[PDB]
Design a protein around this ligand. Structure first.
Ligand SMILES: Nc1ncnc2c1ncn2[C@@H]1O[C@H](COP(=O)(O)OP(=O)(O)NP(=O)(O)O)[C@@H](O)[C@H]1O
Ligand SMILES: [K+]
Ligand SMILES: [K+]
Ligand SMILES: [Mg+2]
Ligand SMILES: [Mg+2]
Length: 314
């Protein structure tokens, strides 16, 4: 909560050193380790350890039970996918504080969904939040981040889907950041730099990685370099899950498939990391099917939807 000086033991001198290391939120310090804090100029161990304990205390991070357990869950807001059936399968829409994955063959609509959500983000009617655990000024001026990994982002389609929704296409584009990553290093660094955007006053509420694994699969082809691949992707996933919790934003990723009828690539690292997993498949014409096959509290379910000039519908 921006004012670091409210932290016991942290005065203006100390507060200065911190804002530098990217630390400028109470949660960020409460979830830090002594090591990553002492890496800053003159921040000792006892100080780093003490402020970490104070931050946790401040953000009240302890044992919770009963009604408090339900309150915590009220901070999760959801974004509509444009499909009534898909929204009902997600039990509302896409959840914040989680990583949800859309895997599927070519043309199954993975990228279309990514584009639609950028548009939907700019429509308060598309956002479903509990007033009890989410203040409106927290949803104010929401922005999306699209990490394009294959070069498929299309300003045109966002605009078209915007018209189809009834918003201004330019509006959506002005509130959507797009970073073209040519490799896993750029992909991972862009994800870690999302903090600097929030630091610059941007309210990042939607983070998209399309595609989540194409770079890794192409950079570590040899299978005697699989442990290598999984390790780097594991750090990426952790970075993604953390920023989803910390900034109460939704992280959305797409995944390709491979035979072995098919399964999303990325191995275990992606399996455990993604909270909601979907398989997208084609049907007749513009019809598509979204199969939820993994989640912590929802049963497997299918949703039929369409891809049209308007975008995602039905
Ligand atoms: N402007 C449009 N109007 C109607 N349909 C469209 C439009 N743009 C794209 N589509 C449809 O979207 C389908 C492909 O969607 P897309 O999201 O790119 O697939 P994908 O899952 O990302 N596959 P891949 O690129 O291999 O990863 C097409 O084959 C078109 O029928
Ligand atoms: K394609
Ligand atoms: K593609
Ligand atoms: Mg989470
Ligand atoms: Mg695609």
């Amino acid at each position: 909560a921006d004012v670091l000086t409210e932290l016991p033991g942290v005065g203006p001198s100390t507060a200065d050193k911190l804002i530098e290391g990217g630390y400028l939120d109470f949660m960020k310090i409460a979830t830090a380790t002594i090591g990553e804090l002492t890496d800053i100029e003159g921040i000792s161990e006892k100080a780093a350890a003490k402020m970490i304990m104070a931050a946790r205390d401040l953000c009240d991070l302890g044992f919770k039970s009963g009604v408090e357990l339900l309150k915590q869950r009220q901070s999760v807001w959801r974004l509509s996918t444009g499909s009534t059936e898909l929204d009902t399968v997600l039990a509302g829409g896409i959840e914040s504080q989680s990583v949800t994955e859309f895997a599927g063959m070519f043309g199954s609509g993975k990228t279309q969904i990514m584009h639609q959500t950028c548009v939907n983000l700019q429509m308060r009617e598309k956002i479903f939040a509990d007033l009890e655990g989410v203040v409106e000024e927290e949803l104010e001026a929401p922005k999306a981040v699209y990490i394009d990994t294959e070069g498929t982002f299309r300003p045109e389609r966002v605009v078209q889907m915007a018209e189809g929704a009834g918003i201004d296409g330019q509006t959506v584009l002005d509130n959507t950041f797009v970073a073209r990553a040519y490799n896993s290093d750029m992909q991972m660094l862009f994800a870690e730099k999302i903090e600097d955007l929030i630091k610059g006053g941007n309210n990042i509420k939607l983070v998209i990685i399309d595609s989540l694994t194409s770079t890794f699969r192409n950079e570590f082809t040899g299978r005697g370099k699989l442990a290598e691949r999984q390790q780097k992707l594991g750090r990426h996933m952790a970075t993604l899950n953390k920023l989803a919790d910390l900034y109460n934003c939704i992280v959305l990723v797409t995944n390709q498939v491979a035979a072995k009828a098919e399964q999303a690539i990325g191995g275990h690292v992606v399996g455990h990391a993604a909270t909601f997993r979907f398989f997208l498949r084609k049907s007749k014409g513009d019809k598509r099917v979204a199969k939820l096959y993994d989640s912590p509290h929802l049963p497997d379910s299918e949703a039929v939807f369409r891809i049209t000039e308007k975008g995602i519908q039905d």
